[PDB]
Every structure is written in structure tokens, then in C-alpha cells.
Amino acid sequence: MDVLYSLSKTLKDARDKIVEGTLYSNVSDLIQQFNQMIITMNGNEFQTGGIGNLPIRNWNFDFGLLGTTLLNLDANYVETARNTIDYFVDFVDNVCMDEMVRESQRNGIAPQSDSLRKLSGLKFKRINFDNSSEYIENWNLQNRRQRTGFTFHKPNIFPYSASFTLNRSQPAHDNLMGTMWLNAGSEIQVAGFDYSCAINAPANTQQFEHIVQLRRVLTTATITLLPDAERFSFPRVINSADGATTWYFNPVILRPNNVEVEFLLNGQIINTYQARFGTIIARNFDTIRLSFQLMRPPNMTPAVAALFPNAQPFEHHATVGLTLRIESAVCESVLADASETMLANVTSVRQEYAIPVGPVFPPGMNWTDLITNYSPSREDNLQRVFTVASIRSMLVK
Amino acid sequence: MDVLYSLSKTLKDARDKIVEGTLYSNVSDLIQQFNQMIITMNGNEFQTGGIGNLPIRNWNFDFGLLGTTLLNLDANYVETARNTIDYFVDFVDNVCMDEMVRESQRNGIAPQSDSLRKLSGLKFKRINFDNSSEYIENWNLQNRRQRTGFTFHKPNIFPYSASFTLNRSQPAHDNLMGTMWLNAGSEIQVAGFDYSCAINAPANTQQFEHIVQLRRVLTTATITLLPDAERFSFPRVINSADGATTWYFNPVILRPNNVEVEFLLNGQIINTYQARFGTIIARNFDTIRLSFQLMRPPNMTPAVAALFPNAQPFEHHATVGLTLRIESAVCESVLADASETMLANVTSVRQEYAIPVGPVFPPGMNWTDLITNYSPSREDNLQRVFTVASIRSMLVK
Amino acid sequence: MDVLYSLSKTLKDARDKIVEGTLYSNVSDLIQQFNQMIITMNGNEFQTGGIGNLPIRNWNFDFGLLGTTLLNLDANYVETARNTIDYFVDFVDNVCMDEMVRESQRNGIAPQSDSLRKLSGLKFKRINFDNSSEYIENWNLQNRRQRTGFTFHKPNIFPYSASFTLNRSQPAHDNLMGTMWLNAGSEIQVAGFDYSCAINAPANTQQFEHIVQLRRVLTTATITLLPDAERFSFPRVINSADGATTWYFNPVILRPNNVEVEFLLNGQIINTYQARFGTIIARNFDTIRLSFQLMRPPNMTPAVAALFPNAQPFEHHATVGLTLRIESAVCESVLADASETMLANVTSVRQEYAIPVGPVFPPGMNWTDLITNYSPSREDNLQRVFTVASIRSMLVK
Amino acid sequence: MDVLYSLSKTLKDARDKIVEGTLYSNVSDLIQQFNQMIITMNGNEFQTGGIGNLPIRNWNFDFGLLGTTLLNLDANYVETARNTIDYFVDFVDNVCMDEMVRESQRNGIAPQSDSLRKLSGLKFKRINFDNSSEYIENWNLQNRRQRTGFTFHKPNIFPYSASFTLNRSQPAHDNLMGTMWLNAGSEIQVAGFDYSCAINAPANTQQFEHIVQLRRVLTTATITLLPDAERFSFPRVINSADGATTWYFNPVILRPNNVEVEFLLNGQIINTYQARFGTIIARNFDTIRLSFQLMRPPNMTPAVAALFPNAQPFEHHATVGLTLRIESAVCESVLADASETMLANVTSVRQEYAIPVGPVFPPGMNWTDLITNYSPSREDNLQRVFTVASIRSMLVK
Amino acid sequence: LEELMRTGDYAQITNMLLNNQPVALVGALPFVTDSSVISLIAKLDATVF
Ligand SMILES: [Zn+2]
Ligand SMILES: [Zn+2]
């Protein structure tokens, strides 16, 4: 595996630092490394593909070295080189792809393909080099077992979930109380509604709460918390819990009262914020708990008083809400986010080559299904597969 | 061109690796490359400017060189160097800017300025070096006529478009059926409304559809698809299609029924998702088609039944919608996105120097106008101009 | 300080380029640099900690240099090295953290800790190198004085502010006119409402305006401007200005008329856009001014006419709005944004070690409070502290 | 750590292979290994204890080797040896115990004690050997990264849970329908009861279901499944769900109809058995789902008919049940089972020395509490602590 | 020592000795006895090196 990495920074730091011009000396340390490779290869034989609509291709090696001679680089030098790189490019592609599809329950971590199982071989280790690529940097540290880590913008930690819970309801659904929400990606929106506007509630206040349990701990999270849930601020006709009928939601929004956000880790409060909207930091948590209340306005102008009668029918439904967005965070486990193309690369290669559903990943690499049951096997396979996608993107985008 | 690049990584990997202290042999491979340049230059005259409010500073060359002694670096060494770099800095700026405005119908893909036309010269080629800056990496691969590629978080593929289409309407606009949408940047929101709540529709279901044709293919797209179009979930007074009057939209939202998203490429379905909300992958497409339906609720509580009478007036307008956001994607053509400053750099330099409107780009480098009529000439000029902006940002931000 | 930097790229470009496999020569220029360090060190002793729950560990040195056993490294070479790096890792951590808490009004832009005050010493400068890490690149340029610069996605320039201003009101709050808004992070949403729908207004048009003053100038900003403020498009019950009662807001949305956005710098219009929605560029500004109008529809279908009577009660409240989002921008001062973990790192280390509130930063490193009163002292301390966080993240995430 | 191991198999394979007589050559390969140790030791002082009722015994080293001369060991040889072993015995005990209590939330997987933190030192690793003790065999493979695995008998995967769920109930509790169960250790017993004997049920059949979610996946499980739940086959007076009163359960047992056991893994059926009683294999699962029905007997002798009237009172309560026992299984995580003494050893040492409750383990090392919230930290600490207990049991039982 | 001679010096030692720092040398070596009370006084043992 680490092998694989090199093969690339080799080519990039190659197809990049080698052109009509430049002095030898700025690549001396480079040329060398390169050749070393060629040698180890030549003679050895390979095979890739043979699964689904994936072409089976065989490759051999027998190439010249490099003029460690010349001072400057003449055009002619390049072309006689690019022609030799373009076999490694078109190669690696066919290599990544081959091990970017196979899954395995037991050792879902290690290599699978007849291509790679031969790479981890010892005689090839004579090639590692420059591992500053964020992903490999982390692959290694994970073998030595130590605190790893990645960087994500609008991460994808929440499996899609859009539902409601009626804490007080009746057949006519004309005087409900409960919450409705949307957890998806890096965002949570939750609204608490009370058709009665807490008319008979103690202290004329109805308490609400929304708890979200992350499948993986997030650390160093920068979060935006805002009052109101715009998504649940408009009239809706919704299916009843049993699917037998439909109810009407006609919200009127009030400011959420006594807002308290807790970021917990293993049941312990790590961060707590009381009514603080804007940007807040949650440094280490596996659970978010949002508590907020609807307090019946003690003083109401006529127009307001008219919305909240002492007796039914309750036609304007008092609603309070919150919106929370995780802009960035660090996770010890790989995840999909709003910037990285890893998930899309893996999913795309599998789709393009009609790769059959395997024993580890959900059909279509479905993110919601994956994160909902993010088993150790799925994570090890995902990391292997994401690391390969990142190696591939250094050369092929 | 490639020339230009070097001139920078030269300075950055310079103004960065030369500080009071460091051991020489960490820069040996560097110093060299540097000098080589100076030589090639000294003995050449340059001119920049001569357009709008752009100065016309002139430059000459005749400089010394650098020791190769000293184990470590003495302060005195730096200053006698920084003073020589600050002429190249203040130079390149005036160079980039000069070729970052001239556009050409013809070969708008090639060099323009009296400054650069002289750089592509052969006697200068003796300078290229370290092309790992994502943009140059891609410039080359393109000149060699090959498969390109870029990275974008929240790309800007949709020209702004906010409108509606009334499939059933009448003068009073009291019983309409149609769709309204907002396509902008990387997002699409579309709502289908039926004032009659499909009372007389076959199977009490009204079908809707929204098609968006991208001006460029996007590959490896990570997309968020959510039910509902919040933007079209509130009461509105809208201008009629002919602009002669205004109609009233009073939505009540129902879940979109039989949602089907198709990502097509040249008329072929590449990816299709049926009612899957959350994160989905579209691996290669030039068109998005969103189909969804409004199905009259077969069972209604009194409160709901009251919104949907058998006869007009229809006062609550049944609405179903979808929201789709392209978080990230790869495009073979340069585009503006939510993270890169290229468009802003080019637009800003032109605005600051009062550069006159040219024959290629729309007034003000207007993105919507540009992407709406993204001709080959505009793309070649945009790429040239974006690549230069990226070269400039390595030194000047 | 610059010292500190090296200590890292030293280790990264180390724990990365040093693997069981690469040829010596691919690190010759590297090994050297390394050793040089060891020497300078060994002997001098250090203290870290001594505050809140921050452990006070004493670090002493005593290490042998580095072999060279030619022709690619043998495993045995690595381990005897990693064991020596893991003391520097666990060290630096304890070093960053120590100077990532102390603050100082007078000269709080320089080193504070007994650990660092000793690093700026002269006998150490003999190390500095490879300053390509965006942040250091900018630290230096600032010590000499020159056009610095940083890159941010969805920047955090607006302190949280959610309020309203009633330009026409009365006790019953049944015929109000004014604006309400939410400024937070990189986004602004503002709505102008007129309960009377400009029935008695000159030209049946009510003018609105929203001005936002940035605490720091933003340059090269890519901005999304869209009509409508979804956040203020739904029914609300709001507290009166004096907190004595609550009013009812029942919006109906019309298109904002004569939209004009001005990006000003020191009172001067730098960029102005008239009714241009979609993507616009604001190249240099410290103030944003949004002007828009509500124009009573001159022609109304019956359904519309019914919402806007000639006399009170006014039950449907005409509302027009705008949404503006700064996707990316450059700032000469450090800021929090939606991608960088700096603020979160600093805030997290302080929270984890129960660091007492100091004289410079607001309690909890609260972003809104910080940006609201972004004094020179807070900025110098923030930059020092952000630069250290970035040095730390090269090794520890 | 691995260090620790050796120290024992050293002594066991020692205090065992050294008896008055044996011909030398059965130990030549042994004696050696031994001495090697003594050397590395002598000269280094050690400290243990320092909490609760744990003595703070200090230790020193300075011992003669072992004449490898003789051909047949004479009694005199033994005694002069046993006297030197009995210091290592009484030592190791005091060593294990010391690190068999300390816990850490963060890196609660690594060494803690001032005794062990010094053992992982490098100058000590000159000892490791003969890692065939099932537990170490697995410690390594885990530190190396691979499919671990342990062997059990009547494993302890189910936290104690004894309860019921009334699907149909009323205040008098005279016509209930629901299930009651006992999940504990490796066994599950569940009964479904219907006081009405499905008199008004569709097809005169009442469906039941019992789902149990394991906290860890079990593989290669040999399971006994039998019809009937003896535990719920006798008359009971039970507390009501709200604790306000007591109900009467007077069961009469019928054979469970349409029994289906599913062993699922991440929602997928891995093994399914339809009405198969006796021994069944579940090869990989994290969930067990037992579905069974009560079918009203279509033909009844008078005595039977008399138990099931068409109208209340229902005095004989129809009950169907299942019993499932996991005889053996493999788990990738350590667990308590019916044969291993690890949990008991750890729990016993802590109890005997009055070790205070720490931050990781529940009070008293309570198994139910531990397995109910089997966090990664608890598992890493448990494995460390179980591995040490196993090292200790090689010498001290 | 062996590890030094059999590999040439880099002065690591040269520096430590120079900024006069506490250091040790392992292995076999000559050795010279001396009875001069005075000697000690003229810190001879600090010479040779
Ligand atoms: Zn974003
Ligand atoms: Zn048994």
C-alpha cells in the first residue's frame, strides 16, 4: 500500500518538475528516486480487472533509464520521457480502480486485488517517498496506532432523518404538541409546536428537546447556531404517525425561550451554551442536545391575542425552533463532507464499471445507509478505498 | 507562458526559504535555479501598461548574483537579496495585470501583451521549474491536448434564473397550476403548485417536472437533495406572465410524491434516484431532471379537508417541492465556485484599473452572462486569465 | 517565533519523507538540516505549563545524530529515529499550548512564555527554513510591513445581530413600517415591511435601506445576492421594542423594487449593482449598503386586491427582502471562517485545560464579542495564537 | 507491554522445567534467555503502589547468573535458583496489580503506572519471546492491525434485562396481550401472551416478536434454540408498567407457531431458521430477532375448550415462548464468559485493595453496566486489564 | 567511541565540548594513574581532551 502512494508523488512531482528548460541540479535528488523504481519493476508481470464490466489488462516492463548526463533539459529529453510516463499513468488508473471495488468482511482493511497483494511484497518496498499528502500521512499513523485526524468543511455526520413526534395528539389532530426535525449532513433544524400556545401549561411554558447521537465523535467543531427553523415555519399537510390520515400544521413563530445546547461526550457535558446564537465551538462530542421552550407571551397586542384563544379551535400554531450547522470539524474516522471528492470518486468508479453489490458496502455506496450502520468493517474498507481515491486524484481527476 | 509560472514559485519558494539562519545546503538546489534566471534576463527591456487607467512603468535589467559560501546565512545576506526580489515582485504584478485584460476574438487562448509575447520567446525557456500548482499542472496537460480536471466546493454552474410557468391559468389567477424555481450557482429549488389540489386530476395526482441544462458537464458531483422548496413556501404576490397584473400565491406544503431525479448525459440517464433524500452521487452529467407529483391526500382530518373544497374559491394552494445542491464536483472547464478567488481577482483588477469592456467578456465579467453564453473563446480567455490570477496569488494576495 | 515554525516542517517533511524504503539521496538535503537542530538543542533545559489545569512537564535533551547506511533505509533505521521524534512531537504540543494561552495588553503581539522567550534567543536562529505554510508566509511579510493576505470560504465578518427597527408604529402595532434583519457570519438577510402596502406613500412606494459596517475591510469578495429574505417570510409574534408587549407579523412577499447594493470603502462607492441577482464581485469594501423598495402593485387581480384594503385593519403585511452571502474573500486581518480550524483549535485548547479568562480575549473566545470589539491588541494576539494553532496542526490534529 | 508477558512464560516455563535431576540440554535454549534478563535489570530501581490499600513496596536488583556448566542438575542448584525466582514472583504480582487499576479516558489503551511506563522503554525490549498464550497472541495482532479473535463458552453478551411490554392492556389487567423476557449472559427467554387466545384476532393468530441488539458482533456461534420459556410458564403477580398496581398472569402453554429466528448483521439477514429447534449455527451477527405466533387451536377437546371462552373473564392465559442459548462464540472484543476468570481476577484485585472508583469503569466493574455502555475506552482498558490478568494467572492463581 | 572512530566525527562532540557541556564516552580505553596531590589542583583531568 504505502508502495502505491509513492508511485504517484513520483509521477506528479515528475510530470510537474520536468520540462523544456530547468537545470539538472533541481531534480538530481529526483531523477535518482525515479530510476530506482524502473529497475525494481522491469521483469515483473501484472494483471488487473476481471470483475463486472471491468477490462482485464496485462502489463510488462522493460524500459531505459535516464540521462543523468546533461546540464540543461532539451525538449527531446522530455518527449522520450513523457512517453514512458504515459504507460504508468494509464497503468496506475487501472490499478487503483481494481482495488477500489473489492470488499472483505474479515480483513476488510488489508489489500485484495491480484495487483496489490503483489505490491505489499517485500522486494517492492524499495520505493516509498514524500508522504506529505494529508491522507497517507494519516494512513501510516494508523498502522503505528496513534491519534490520526482529518479536515472537513460542512462534514456529513448526520444520516438523513426527517420526522416528527407528537407528544399530545388526538384523532382530529386539532390540538397537537411535539417536535419535527430534519437532520442531514452537517445540519439540524428542529421545531417545537404547541397548538394551545401553552394555555394550560405550568408557567405557560412548554419544554422541548431534540437529541442527536453522532456515529463518530467530532472534535474542534466550528458551529453556527441560529434561532428559528425556517424549514418548519410554513403551512403543511402532513401524514399522521400511522399513515391513516393527514393533519394540518399552520405555524406562527415565537422566539425560542431558554435555549440550551449541550455537546456531550459519553454522557458528559463537554460544552454548554445558553441562548448563544452565532458562532460557537464544540471541542469534542458524540451527542448534541438542544433544549428550548415555547413561552406563552404574557402581554399581547389585540392582533396577537386573537391568534391564541382560551378555547379551541386553535387555528394558529405556536412554534419555536433552532438551526445548527457544523461548518468544520475534525474526525478520527473518514467521512464524506462538502468539499472532498473521495466518496464521489469511489461511488463513481463502481457505478461506471457496473461493480456488483458486495458484502460490506450498502447498495450504491449510499451515504445515509453507510453512516447509519458505520461498522468497523465499513470504516476500514472506506478508509482504504478513500485513501486509494486520494492517491488516484493526484494524477487523474 | 509556462515561463511566467516559474518566475513565481521561484520567488515564493524563495522569499520563503531564505531567512536569517538556515543552513545553505537546504537551498543549494535552489540558489542555482535562481541565478540561471538573472542571467537570461540582464540585457532585456520591458514595457507594461498603456490601457485605461493602467500605469506604464518601464523596466531594465543589470544585476549581481550570490555567494555559495557560508555554512549558515547571515542577516546581511538576506537584505542584499530582498532588495533584489522586491524589483521582481513589483514587476511581475505589473506583468500579470497587463496580460490580464487584453482579450482576443481570434486566438484569445494565446499570449497578447508586448510583455508576454516576448516571454514565450525561446531564449527564455531556460527557466521552467516545479509545476505543482494545481493550475499550471492543468495548463500543461491541456496544451498537450489531453484530459484536464479541477476541484470546486459549491461550484457556480447555474446562471441565475428565477421564474415560473403557468400550465393552467386564467385572467383572475384564482386556479393556477405550474412551477416556479430559482436556479443559481450550485443550487436549484423548484416548486409545483396546483390551486385545485388535483380535485379533477387523474388519480388525484398532478405531475411536475423541472429540467436544468448545464453549460458544461460536471463529473464526480456530491449532491444534497431534500424535499420541499422553502423559497416557495410562503405567500407571494407575483407579476403575471405578461406583466399586466399581479396574482396571489398562498402555499400549503405537502410531501413531494414519486420523486425521481435523473442526471443525464447527452440524453442518456447516467444516474437515477427515486425518492432518495440526503447525499447522492451524480458521476457524469450535463442535465438534471427533477420529476415530482402532488397527490391529493386520500384521507383528511377536518382541518385539512377545510383547505381543499370541491369547488372554488381555492384559498390554500397545494404545493410540493425539491431542493438540490451540488456541494462539490469536477469540471473539465474552469468555473467560478464558492472557494476560489480567481473570478474575483480578474474582475477586481479590471475594475480597479478602469479597463474598458472588450470583445470577449460581458461587461463587468458578469458571471451569469458569462456562463449563459460560455463560448469556446470565453472559456479559453477565462482559463488563461484564471491561470494568471492563480500565478499572481502565489505572491500577491 | 519563526524558529518555532521550522521545528515542525522539520518533523512533517520528516515523519513523512522518512520511510522503510526511500533511497538516502532523496533526503540528503534533509538529514543535514535535521541534525543541525539536535546540536543547537541538547543541554539547554525547558519549562512548560504553570497555569490552570495545565501540567508542568520538564523537558531535557540528550540525543545522538543520524546515520546514513546507504542505498535506501533499513527498517531498523526508522524505529531508532521515530523514537527520537516522538519526544519532539509530545514536546512541541506542550510548547504550542503554553504560548497559546498567555495574553498581554501592552505588548501582547510578541512571545510571552518562559518557553518561547528563550526561543527568540539568537543562538537558535540557526534553523529557519521552507516557509511555504500560508500562515508563516504571512507572518514574516508583516514584520517588515507589506501587503499581507489570507484566503477564507464563507468568512465570519458579521457579529451576530438579529433585530428590527420600526419606522412607523403605534401601541396596537397594527400598522407598522420598518425593517428586520439577521447579520451573522458571512450572511445578511433583511426585510422591509409596510403594513399599509404604501397606500398613502408618495408614488405608492416605500423606501428601505440596510447598512452593515464591517470591522475589517474585505477585498476580492465573491458574493451571492438573491431577492427575498426567507427568514422573514413567515408569521411571527415578536417582542415590542420596549419589551412591554408582543406584535404580530403576517408577511406576504413582493419582489424588491429598485434594488441597489453598494460596497463602500471609507464612504466611497467602490462597487454598485442595480437589481443584479446571482454572483457579483465586491473588490474592496468596509461597508455594505442595501437599498430596496416596496412598490404597491398598480394592477391587482381580485385575490391580490383583497389583501390590500384602503382602510385598516391591515391583515396581510407587504414585505420585500434581500439575501446576501459572502462566499469567499481576502482579509488583511485573521478572521474565523467556515473552513479553517484555527479559532476552534485555540478555543478548544483553552477549554480543555480550564484556562482562566485573561485581559485580552472575551470569555470563551466568543466570536461575536471578539469581532464586535476587534481591537488592535485582540488582533495581534489572535494572529499570534492562530499562527501557533496552524503550526501545531501540521503535526497534531 | 509485550515486555511484561515474557517476564512470566519466563518464570512458568522456568519454575516448571527446573526440577532436581533433568538433563541440562532440555533447558540450554532456556537458561540463556533467562540470564539475558537479569543483566538488563540489575541496577534499575522500581516503585509500585500508591493508592487505596495498596502498599508502596520498593525494589532493587543485583543477582548472580546461573552456572550453565553441569550436565545433570543437583538439588543444590535448584534452591539457589528458587530463592531468586521468589523475588520476581512477589514482584510481578505487585507489578500487575499496580497497572491493573489505573485508567485513562484519552489513551486508556496504553501503559500508565510509573512501573510500566518504564518497561515499554527501549533498553528493555531485549526480552520478548514465546507469545503462544492466547491473549498476548491477540494483543499483538491488534497492535499490528488485523482480525483478532477469542474463544468462549456461555459468553456474557446480554446485559441483564428482565421486563415486559403490554401491547393491549386496560386498568383491570384482565385481558392483556404482550411479551415478557429475560436477557442475561448468553441466554434469552421470551414469552408472548394473549389473554383472549386470539379469539378476535385475524386468522385467530397473534404475532409476537423479540429483538435483541448485541453490543458487539459475535461470530461462529453455536446456539441451542428450544420452544417454550419455562421462566414464564408459571403464575405470577407482576407490577404494572406505572408501578401503581399489580396484575395476575396465569399461563397455559401452547407450541409457538411459525417460529423464525433471524441473526442479522447491520440490518441484513445473515442466518435465518424456520421452526428449527436444537442446535443451530449463527456465523456473524449483531442482532437476534425472534418472531413467533400464538394460534388459537382450531380443534379443542372439552377440557381445552373450557379454558378459552368466547367472552371474558379470561382465566387461563395462552402463552407461547422460546429459549435461546449461545453455547460458544468468537468475539473480536474481550467479554466475560462462563469459563474465563479474567473479569473475576480484575474485579477481585480491585475489591481486595479497596481501589477507588475511577473515570472509566462502572462501580464494582459491574458487568451489566459495562456491557450496556461498552465504549471504546472501556474496551481498551478492559483488554489491557484482561491481558494483564491472564499474564498474572500463569504464575499466581 | 567505537561508533565514532569507525565512522569519523561530525563534531557533535566538538560542539558539546566547546560550549563546555556535560558528556560521556563509552568503551575500553588507556588509563593513567597519578599521585600528584598538586595535579588535581591544576585540574589536569580537564586537559587531555
Ligand atoms: Zn459552504
Ligand atoms: Zn456450561
XYZ file of C-alpha atoms in Angstrom, chain D residues 30-309:
280
model
C 16.074 -21.756 28.178
C 18.797 -20.919 30.693
C 20.248 -18.472 28.173
C 17.044 -16.482 27.631
C 16.780 -16.261 31.373
C 20.164 -14.765 32.176
C 19.819 -12.202 29.367
C 17.070 -10.776 31.541
C 18.909 -10.495 34.847
C 21.505 -8.370 33.076
C 19.143 -5.821 31.547
C 17.610 -5.456 35.023
C 20.247 -5.164 37.743
C 20.897 -1.527 38.558
C 17.453 -0.117 37.881
C 15.237 0.717 40.901
C 11.450 0.297 40.838
C 8.353 1.678 42.547
C 4.819 0.296 42.901
C 1.553 1.009 44.654
C 0.346 4.354 45.906
C -3.457 4.215 46.157
C -6.218 2.897 48.385
C -4.899 -0.027 50.400
C -2.073 -0.768 48.008
C 1.313 -0.895 49.774
C 4.208 1.089 48.311
C 6.852 -1.655 48.142
C 10.230 -0.649 46.625
C 12.556 -2.952 44.646
C 16.233 -3.351 43.699
C 18.413 -5.692 41.586
C 21.870 -7.304 41.836
C 21.898 -11.053 41.120
C 24.379 -13.698 40.084
C 23.733 -15.562 36.826
C 23.252 -19.302 36.517
C 26.151 -21.707 36.057
C 25.373 -23.248 32.683
C 28.102 -25.799 33.428
C 26.631 -29.001 34.930
C 25.110 -31.853 32.913
C 22.537 -33.004 35.443
C 21.085 -30.526 37.925
C 21.765 -31.221 41.591
C 19.237 -30.223 44.249
C 21.638 -27.531 45.454
C 21.254 -25.916 42.030
C 17.520 -25.599 42.351
C 17.277 -23.933 45.790
C 19.894 -21.306 44.891
C 17.574 -20.559 41.992
C 14.099 -20.767 43.522
C 15.305 -18.193 46.051
C 15.999 -15.828 43.170
C 12.706 -16.510 41.429
C 10.605 -15.873 44.533
C 11.689 -12.220 44.365
C 10.442 -11.941 40.793
C 7.227 -13.702 41.644
C 6.388 -11.471 44.667
C 7.490 -8.692 42.335
C 5.438 -9.189 39.210
C 2.342 -9.621 41.447
C 2.955 -6.131 42.853
C 3.523 -5.006 39.264
C 0.433 -6.398 37.617
C -1.791 -5.175 40.396
C -0.360 -1.623 40.096
C -1.312 -1.208 36.414
C -4.483 -3.226 36.931
C -6.354 -0.294 38.370
C -5.209 2.951 36.769
C -7.461 4.146 33.934
C -7.357 6.918 31.301
C -10.195 8.427 29.229
C -7.923 9.564 26.356
C -5.210 6.954 25.778
C -6.742 4.436 28.149
C -5.265 1.711 25.974
C -1.587 2.384 26.672
C 0.549 1.946 29.858
C 0.001 4.154 32.924
C 1.954 3.191 36.082
C 5.406 4.531 36.941
C 6.293 0.860 36.891
C 5.204 0.043 33.355
C 5.767 3.427 31.642
C 9.424 2.493 32.278
C 9.048 -1.028 30.879
C 7.937 -0.006 27.409
C 11.313 1.731 27.399
C 13.603 0.567 24.600
C 16.553 -0.766 26.606
C 14.155 -3.424 27.889
C 12.688 -4.918 24.732
C 15.781 -7.185 24.700
C 13.482 -9.830 26.227
C 10.254 -10.674 24.334
C 9.573 -14.357 23.405
C 7.172 -17.404 23.186
C 3.897 -15.485 22.666
C 1.606 -18.507 22.442
C -0.652 -17.506 25.380
C -3.973 -16.986 23.600
C -4.223 -13.436 24.993
C -0.893 -12.000 24.025
C -1.267 -13.754 20.651
C -4.239 -11.445 20.282
C -2.727 -8.363 21.863
C -0.029 -8.160 19.197
C -2.269 -8.771 16.163
C -4.333 -5.836 17.413
C -1.360 -3.503 17.848
C -0.336 -4.601 14.365
C -3.811 -4.224 12.849
C -5.698 -7.408 11.892
C -8.588 -9.783 12.604
C -8.016 -10.661 16.257
C -10.397 -13.198 17.846
C -11.043 -15.009 21.167
C -12.744 -18.283 22.144
C -15.601 -18.542 24.694
C -18.322 -20.681 26.322
C -21.721 -19.399 27.515
C -20.255 -15.855 26.741
C -21.671 -12.820 28.533
C -23.080 -10.601 25.798
C -26.541 -9.718 27.119
C -26.774 -7.112 29.865
C -29.315 -8.255 32.424
C -32.785 -7.188 31.317
C -35.993 -8.622 32.710
C -39.183 -6.830 31.666
C -42.452 -6.896 29.683
C -44.378 -4.885 27.129
C -48.151 -4.809 27.168
C -49.427 -4.347 23.631
C -53.070 -4.469 24.800
C -53.945 -3.645 28.380
C -56.599 -1.969 30.433
C -56.803 -0.827 34.087
C -58.145 -4.154 35.398
C -55.343 -6.048 33.555
C -57.820 -8.829 32.848
C -57.274 -9.062 29.080
C -53.615 -8.363 28.249
C -51.501 -9.158 25.228
C -47.744 -8.649 25.011
C -44.368 -10.154 25.758
C -42.125 -10.639 28.769
C -38.483 -11.681 28.706
C -35.158 -12.233 30.424
C -31.954 -11.432 28.541
C -28.903 -12.291 30.619
C -25.430 -13.527 29.814
C -25.655 -15.857 26.869
C -29.365 -16.593 27.241
C -32.689 -15.205 26.116
C -36.135 -16.443 27.168
C -39.172 -14.675 25.778
C -42.882 -15.383 26.048
C -45.784 -13.916 24.131
C -49.152 -13.990 25.926
C -52.713 -13.213 24.765
C -55.386 -13.496 27.464
C -58.064 -13.731 24.740
C -56.347 -16.695 22.986
C -56.648 -14.795 19.698
C -60.497 -15.089 19.818
C -60.937 -11.842 17.783
C -57.566 -11.923 16.015
C -57.212 -12.209 12.200
C -56.803 -15.898 11.343
C -57.053 -16.475 15.127
C -53.319 -15.854 15.272
C -51.448 -13.304 17.393
C -47.957 -12.369 16.203
C -45.071 -11.787 18.636
C -41.547 -10.591 18.180
C -38.482 -10.106 20.366
C -35.394 -8.231 19.166
C -32.062 -8.198 20.977
C -29.211 -5.962 19.861
C -25.737 -7.142 20.821
C -23.190 -4.508 21.816
C -20.539 -6.450 19.899
C -20.748 -8.795 16.924
C -20.466 -12.468 17.666
C -19.151 -14.819 15.015
C -19.061 -18.638 14.791
C -21.792 -19.020 17.462
C -23.151 -22.464 18.354
C -26.653 -21.938 19.635
C -29.386 -24.030 21.308
C -32.931 -22.938 20.421
C -35.832 -24.603 22.167
C -39.565 -23.961 22.142
C -41.167 -22.685 25.385
C -39.975 -20.226 28.015
C -40.093 -22.156 31.301
C -39.302 -18.984 33.200
C -42.658 -17.530 32.067
C -44.748 -20.664 32.312
C -45.914 -20.240 35.868
C -48.463 -17.991 37.703
C -47.213 -14.576 38.582
C -48.321 -11.386 40.222
C -46.490 -8.581 38.478
C -46.171 -4.833 38.973
C -47.987 -2.701 36.407
C -45.932 -0.624 33.965
C -46.510 2.553 36.062
C -45.851 0.770 39.353
C -49.282 1.785 40.654
C -50.758 -1.742 40.980
C -50.235 -5.465 40.311
C -51.653 -7.790 37.633
C -52.148 -11.546 37.532
C -50.535 -13.824 34.929
C -51.898 -17.363 34.847
C -50.238 -19.026 31.793
C -51.209 -22.142 29.890
C -48.623 -23.041 27.255
C -49.151 -23.811 23.559
C -46.481 -24.560 20.969
C -45.046 -21.490 19.344
C -46.357 -21.288 15.763
C -44.288 -20.117 12.726
C -41.104 -19.666 14.680
C -38.485 -17.696 12.775
C -35.099 -16.727 14.175
C -33.025 -14.220 12.294
C -29.412 -13.382 13.054
C -28.790 -10.053 11.424
C -25.673 -8.036 10.800
C -26.140 -4.323 10.125
C -29.786 -4.911 9.228
C -29.044 -7.772 6.867
C -30.222 -11.327 7.494
C -27.088 -13.475 7.740
C -28.813 -16.594 9.106
C -32.471 -17.491 9.286
C -34.090 -20.580 10.784
C -37.753 -21.503 10.499
C -39.028 -23.596 13.349
C -35.721 -25.367 13.811
C -35.173 -26.393 17.428
C -31.964 -27.948 18.715
C -28.501 -26.829 17.634
C -28.125 -24.077 15.009
C -25.126 -22.017 13.823
C -25.167 -18.187 13.566
C -21.913 -17.286 11.807
C -21.800 -13.448 12.143
C -24.415 -11.205 13.728
C -25.015 -8.142 15.913
C -28.754 -8.680 16.315
C -31.120 -11.542 17.026
C -34.779 -11.339 16.099
C -37.210 -13.973 17.336
C -40.675 -14.000 15.730
C -43.323 -16.447 16.847
C -47.109 -16.693 16.994
C -49.911 -17.938 19.170
C -52.508 -19.640 17.054
C -55.851 -20.389 18.674
C -56.312 -24.196 18.453
C -58.841 -24.823 15.659
C -59.949 -28.079 17.346
C -60.324 -28.397 21.087
C -61.317 -31.239 23.395
C -63.853 -30.142 26.089
C -61.125 -29.648 28.719
C -59.274 -27.310 26.352
C -62.402 -25.532 25.083
C -63.239 -24.739 28.728
C -60.047 -22.714 29.151
C -60.851 -20.432 26.220
C -64.399 -18.922 26.355
